[PDB]
């Protein structure tokens, strides 16, 4: 049974940097890419890391991504407001054939 | 400019079927690998469908058999047949772009769902 | 509560084709002997088509071979799929629960059936 | 040919006994179970009276249903306003496999 887990929720206030884990089984997230999506409010996810670690298209600087062994890292220097929004981590899980993707996190500012 | 707008949400009645549409500019559906992927409100993105290039289809485990993706010959655009509905099928459909099996790049703005009387 | 609500009923054109549903809740369609019955604005019940537990069918004269009658697997909701209609098919069709063959106990609301251009 | 024959209309007032009579040939009634149901203005039939003489599930009082021969008969003590609706005899011909109604009463109180 392989659906990788995220916290329900992850909140900071600003200047001060944010970390999101996305943990899984090693069937997908140990043997296939993670990537991260930010979803807005109302809106539609928008791609924000890719291929474990790149940046896309100058997404907004010091959002890092990072990848130890079966889990997955998003990182945002300081909680600025805007980047309030929903985080998703997806993977191709081949055992299932499928993308699979994790709880989401409820970003908040303090 | 790079854009997916789809079509056909609305309420419909539990069995019923629809024909949901995804139109593509900019880019060429019958290449690029398409994907259909819906999120209940309050809810996470489940992947429901891929085509790939040369035709083939993948399809989820709570999405198999009833539904189907198709990929016009001509209109630049794709389709989701979605037939025997329940209660679990109530949606916000998107169509991405996705880069091979890694990454999806681009979404469409969304097309509700409801099944309900 | 028992309740059975009807629904697919409106305007349509002579030799048209339309599936009315028949919606059971509190009771189970795949069991009580399920029928479907019609009336003509002033006009009197007619018997259209009964559903046995046993998958069996009965339709009447007039009703013969251009309609049928069928049973969800899963739904709880029955189907009457009308087709090749003409003038003396105009009704408020209802779906009734009949123990047995002896009387018709529940009585769902009732939709319009229309058959004009 | 089998179909139960009912008066197009019966009238009486407000404490006066109501009969209905419906009849038809031997084939359906003679042989199968007469049931009485009560249509209301703009709604849906309601059962009441079933299997010759029953009154089910506690429906108002006074109401009677008898069989004689090839004939049925509904008795209502009084003509109520309430009670105005049109009256249905349905039995199962058998020679037909049918469900056979009646003409229908147009019930009026004087």
């Known amino acids: 049974q392989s659906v990788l887990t995220q916290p329900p929720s992850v909140s900071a206030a600003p200047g001060q940097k944010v970390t999101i884990s996305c943990?899984?089984?090693?069937?997908?997230?140990?043997?296939?890419?993670?990537?991260?999506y930010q979803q807005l409010p109302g809106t539609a996810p928008k791609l924000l890391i890719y291929d474990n670690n790149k940046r896309p298209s100058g997404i907004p600087d010091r959002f890092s991504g990072s990848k130890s062994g079966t889990s997955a890292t998003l990182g945002i220097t300081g909680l600025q407001t805007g980047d309030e929004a929903d985080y998703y981590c997806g993977t191709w899980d081949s055992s299932l054939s499928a993308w699979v993707f994790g709880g989401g996190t409820k970003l908040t500012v303090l | 400019e790079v854009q997916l707008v789809e079509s056909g949400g609305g309420l419909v009645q539990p069995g019923g079927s629809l024909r949901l549409s995804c139109?593509?500019?900019?880019?060429?559906?019958?290449?690029?690998?398409?994907?259909?992927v819906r999120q209940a409100p309050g809810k996470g993105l489940e992947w429901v469908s891929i085509i790939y290039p040369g035709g083939s289809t993948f399809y989820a485990d709570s999405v198999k058999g009833r539904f189907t993706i198709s990929r016009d010959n001509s209109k630049n655009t794709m389709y989701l047949q979605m037939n025997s509905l329940r209660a679990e099928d109530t949606a916000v459909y998107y169509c991405a772009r996705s880069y091979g099996d890694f990454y999806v790049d681009f979404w469409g703005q969304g097309t509700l769902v409801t099944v309900s009387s | 509560e028992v309740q059975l609500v009807e629904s697919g009923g409106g305007l349509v054109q002579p030799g048209g084709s339309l599936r009315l549903s028949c919606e059971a809740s509190?009771?189970?369609?795949?069991?009580?002997?399920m029928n479907w019955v019609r009336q003509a604005p002033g006009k009197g019940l007619e018997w259209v088509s009964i559903i046995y537990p046993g998958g069996s069918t009965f339709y009447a004269d007039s009703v013969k071979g251009r309609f049928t009658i069928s049973r969800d697997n899963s739904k709880n909701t029955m189907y009457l799929q009308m087709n090749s209609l003409r003038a003396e098919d105009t009704a408020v069709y209802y779906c009734a629960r009949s123990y047995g063959d002896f009387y018709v106990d529940f009585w769902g609301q009732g939709t319009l059936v229309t058959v004009s251009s | 040919q089998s179909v139960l024959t009912q008066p197009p209309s019966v009238s009486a007032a407000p404490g006066q006994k109501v009969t209905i009579s419906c009849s038809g040939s031997?084939?359906?009634?003679?042989?199968?179970?007469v049931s009485w149901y009560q249509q209301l203005p703009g709604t849906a039939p309601k059962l009441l009276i079933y299997d010759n003489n029953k009154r089910p599930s506690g429906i108002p009082d006074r109401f009677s249903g008898s069989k004689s021969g090839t004939s049925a008969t509904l008795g209502i003590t009084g003509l109520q306003t309430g009670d105005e609706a049109d009256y249905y005899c349905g039995t199962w011909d058998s020679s037909l496999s049918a469900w056979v109604f009646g003409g229908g009463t147009k019930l009026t109180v004087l």
């Open positions: 031997s084939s359906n009634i003679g042989n199968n179970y």
């Open positions: 509190e009771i189970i369609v795949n069991r009580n002997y």
